[PDB]
Amino acid sequence: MVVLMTKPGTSDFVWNGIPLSMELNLWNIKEYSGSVAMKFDGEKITFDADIQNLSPKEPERYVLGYPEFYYGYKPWENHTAEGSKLPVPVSSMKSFSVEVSFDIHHEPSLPLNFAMETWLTREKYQTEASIGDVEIMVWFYFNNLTPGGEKIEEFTIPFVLNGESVEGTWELWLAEWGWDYLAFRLKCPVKKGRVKFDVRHFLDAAGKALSSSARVKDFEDLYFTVWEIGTEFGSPETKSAQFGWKFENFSIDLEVREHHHH
Amino acid sequence: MVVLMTKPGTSDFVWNGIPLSMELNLWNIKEYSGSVAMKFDGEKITFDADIQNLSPKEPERYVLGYPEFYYGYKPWENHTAEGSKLPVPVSSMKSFSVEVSFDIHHEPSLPLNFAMETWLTREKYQTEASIGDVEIMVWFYFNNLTPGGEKIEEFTIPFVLNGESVEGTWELWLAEWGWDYLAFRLKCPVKKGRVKFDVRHFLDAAGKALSSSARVKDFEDLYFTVWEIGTEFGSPETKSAQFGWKFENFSIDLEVREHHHHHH
Ligand SMILES: [Br-]
Ligand SMILES: [Br-]
Ligand SMILES: [Br-]
Ligand SMILES: [Br-]
Ligand SMILES: [Br-]
Ligand SMILES: [Br-]
Ligand SMILES: [Br-]
């Protein structure tokens, strides 16, 4: 299964029996010159960009794009690969373990992160996120890039790094924009390696942080729609972007609480 | 050569052609029960503690002990293993690279660090440290423990981590006690791995930080007496300690400055 993209768009693929979507996502790019290439070869997914003459569509949104791949339904795209077990309500999720090997390369000054995210929505199949909805980001890497909003808390969350169980300190950045923006940023970023973690830990911390919010009142009743894996890049000042990534050894294990458990 | 200790004290040993001293150091423990064991087997050095009924000698000093090994002369113990190249004046040191593989294990609540250190003295073989002398610690790991004094600066200092060159951010903690206490703490602690770094880089940052000191007058003229490698542990509320460590693949490389003979 060789799936290749050289311009913005979305393609579905199957990796280790998991149905997924790849998105060469340049959402906030107005214009550009150069090259972009996304490829899935059956064993791995890679992305490379060597783009110039950049301008943002909306300078206030800061980042330029998010080349990624995802499991589940992405609301902003009205899209899901066939056979995905997502969306599921947050209350029915016992655990959601994600495993991936990664390598991030970039031109040194480039604002960039290695971020994973979900959209928590009131309705199962929304086409946007608004007041009452949540965007939860998990940053494993960052370079000359700070999350949006303000740092409100710090959480200790375990994960497996290169087969070793480690306790990470995750900064929580909150913003009350069109929707609720929550970004958990690892204090000690990792550019390459293999990580294994349970998304449930980030859902617990986010529910606890939103426990006094007048906007997100029924946290556990929201639908966990997707799990996106990619790199946000750029700033309103970025005119040239040279970077890429490689993802390998990918696996997801979703545990849903049902009547036969216990 | 097998070196084994099961109570506080010192023993000399030779590792990969390097003369060293091991110290089962419980310096601030007034009393204890349970087991302590330090061992060198030719290839590695290990320590294990399963101690209870702990009480400090001086509660104000906070930590309970520092089981360690060292290269050179430790002033407080008036001791050196035969054949060490230290003490040397700081000005003479071009480079002092240290390499070690380490694994620290401990009960989760235990106050503990993986800290390396030197004592910078005015005279070559002092028996203690006082005003004008410096204590410089390098913390690669910490658990439920903060260095003494206050955070006065942050420094970018490179090191090799698991064969990859990295640039650590180190907090500098400074305290004006009986001597000057300086502690460089890695913002991103590592309890297991392989590290290679140059002590000269920490001395350069310690020299800058102490540039306008009324106590420390001439940094480069002081003697670099020792390089201690161990784990500080405990607190005045610590009643029992369960932890251990293992150190392997140890090497040091001292590069001294060359002299040019003047005829006057
Ligand atoms: Br295409
Ligand atoms: Br690059
Ligand atoms: Br961390
Ligand atoms: Br997991
Ligand atoms: Br233990
Ligand atoms: Br660091
Ligand atoms: Br180095």
TrEMBL record, chain A:
<keyword id="KW-0119">Carbohydrate metabolism</keyword>
<dbReference type="InterPro" id="IPR002594">
    <property type="entry name" value="GH12"/>
</dbReference>
<comment type="similarity">
    <text>Belongs to the glycosyl hydrolase 12 (cellulase H) family.</text>
</comment>
<dbReference type="InterPro" id="IPR013320">
    <property type="entry name" value="ConA-like_dom_sf"/>
</dbReference>
<dbReference type="GO" id="GO:0008810">
    <property type="term" value="F:cellulase activity"/>
</dbReference>
<keyword id="KW-0624">Polysaccharide degradation</keyword>
<keyword id="KW-0378">Hydrolase</keyword>
<keyword id="KW-0326">Glycosidase</keyword>
<protein>
    <submittedName>
        <fullName>Endoglucanase</fullName>
    </submittedName>
</protein>
<dbReference type="GO" id="GO:0000272">
    <property type="term" value="P:polysaccharide catabolic process"/>
</dbReference>
<dbReference type="InterPro" id="IPR013319">
    <property type="entry name" value="GH11/12"/>
</dbReference>
<dbReference type="Pfam" id="PF01670">
    <property type="entry name" value="Glyco_hydro_12"/>
</dbReference>
Automatic annotation (TrEMBL), chain B:
<keyword id="KW-0624">Polysaccharide degradation</keyword>
<comment type="similarity">
    <text>Belongs to the glycosyl hydrolase 12 (cellulase H) family.</text>
</comment>
<dbReference type="InterPro" id="IPR013320">
    <property type="entry name" value="ConA-like_dom_sf"/>
</dbReference>
<dbReference type="InterPro" id="IPR013319">
    <property type="entry name" value="GH11/12"/>
</dbReference>
<dbReference type="Pfam" id="PF01670">
    <property type="entry name" value="Glyco_hydro_12"/>
</dbReference>
<protein>
    <submittedName>
        <fullName>Endoglucanase</fullName>
    </submittedName>
</protein>
<keyword id="KW-0119">Carbohydrate metabolism</keyword>
<dbReference type="InterPro" id="IPR002594">
    <property type="entry name" value="GH12"/>
</dbReference>
<keyword id="KW-0326">Glycosidase</keyword>
<keyword id="KW-0378">Hydrolase</keyword>
<dbReference type="GO" id="GO:0000272">
    <property type="term" value="P:polysaccharide catabolic process"/>
</dbReference>
<dbReference type="GO" id="GO:0008810">
    <property type="term" value="F:cellulase activity"/>
</dbReference>
